[PDB]
Amino acid sequence: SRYTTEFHELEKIGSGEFGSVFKCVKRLDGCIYAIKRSKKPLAGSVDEQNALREVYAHAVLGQHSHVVRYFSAWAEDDHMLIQNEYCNGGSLADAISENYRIMSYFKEAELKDLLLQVGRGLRYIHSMSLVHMDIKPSNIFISRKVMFKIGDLGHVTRISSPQVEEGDSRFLANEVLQENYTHLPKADIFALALTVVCAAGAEPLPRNGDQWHEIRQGRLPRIPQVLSQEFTELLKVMIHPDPERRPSAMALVKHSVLLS
Ligand SMILES: C=CCn1c(=O)c2cnc(Nc3ccc(N4CCN(C)CC4)c(Cl)c3)nc2n1-c1cccc(C(C)(C)O)n1
Ligand SMILES: [Cl-]
């Protein structure tokens, strides 16, 4: 077994229908990696194309400071294995939950830093003619003095000829629901805005219904933080009903409210 041979398993750090994720030490180099171990999906299935999307996303992307680095992927024992960078801070979702527990919070500055960093990740992905299509707190990872990195590339697809597996409904732009895939990068932008709103301590986002539609009308969820009207206005245009009115990733990262 390659997994057993090359790595020592330390701790399970995730589980779901996707399988399990393990913090592991690679014996050769002594470095820590996050390894996902999944049952190999049925051929030609939803699970397979999603798994495929991730490998071939990696084939294109290479390496960037705001994308979780991919090292290797292989299959054995009717299981799939994906070896990624280990981010010692967990996901943004984990951080948000912990914030709520010990009633801490991300400062307004920290929200802007989060927005800029993931924005840089998106600009790179978009520059490679790809879109993430599943941006949300649980897919943003934290290293350490803090670095935010985009992970979980299972929904990544091409801007040109996309195979769109829709992401979490809570973060999904209406035009994607409407099967309008002519501006998918702006769907990532929509999702990032709501991701920041979650980090800002907004109540849980709706899966559907009235509240759901209200958001897609360009109405921000309620936010207990005292945020500047300017930063607030930036988050609002990011969820504008017209995706062409939303800023591109590159327009986002060179925005005044964010800089520096
Ligand atoms: C390889 C799989 C994707 N993935 C990374 O690339 C990846 C890179 N780094 C981390 N770091 C990290 C994840 C989780 C905690 N904790 C432990 C203690 N608590 C249980 C809270 C969470 C800590 Cl400390 C570090 N995780 C990563 N991944 C990861 C992990 C779990 C679930 C998922 C899913 C649901 C598939 O998205 N992914
Ligand atoms: Cl676009």
Resolution of the coordinates, Å: 1.9
Ligand nearest the Cα atom of residue 138: 1
Kindly give the distance from the C-alpha atom of residue 218 to the centroid of ligand 1, in angstroms, as a whole number. Answer: 32
Residue 48 neighbours by CB under 8 Å, 6+ apart:
41, 42
Strand 70-76 versus strand 130-131 pairing type: unpaired
Is any atom of ligand 1 closer than 6 Å to the C-beta of 13? yes
Q: Which two tokens stand for residue 47?
A: 């699970």
CA 73, 87, 97: angle at the middle one, nearest 5? 120
Report chain breaks in the chain, C–N > 2.5 Å, as residues after which they occur: 144
CB of residue 239 inside a 6 A radius of ligand 1: no
Domains 1-63+69-87 and 64-68+88-260 share a fold: no
- Give the whole-angstrom CA distance, residue 76 versus residue 116: 39
Largest CA distance in the chain: 56
CB contact burial 11-33 (16+ within 10 A = b; e otherwise): eebbeeebbebbbbbeeeeeeeb
Domain ranges of the chain: 1-63+69-87, 64-68+88-260
Instruction: Find out if CATH 1.10.510.10 is the number for domain 64-68+88-260.
Output: yes
CA end-to-end distance (rounded Å), the chain: 48
The atom of ligand 1 lying closest to the CA of 83 is 1
Q: Which pair of tokens denotes residue 41? A: 């999906």
Compute how many other C-beta atoms are within 10 angstroms of the C-beta atom of residue 68.
Answer: 20
- Among 200, 193, 192, which residue's Cα sits nearest to residue 222? 200
Structure tokens at 107: 């400062």
Residue 34 CB less than 6 A away from ligand 1:
yes
CA of 172 to the centre of ligand 1 (A): 22
CA distance 2 to 100: 40
- Ligand-binding site membership of 154 (annotated): yes
Distance from C-alpha of 146 to C-alpha of 90, rounded to nearest angstrom: 12
Q: Which CATH superfamily is domain 1-63+69-87 in?
A: Phosphorylase Kinase; domain 1 (3.30.200.20)
What technique was this entry resolved by? X-ray
**Nearest partner of 189 among 128, 242, 225, judged by Cα:** 242
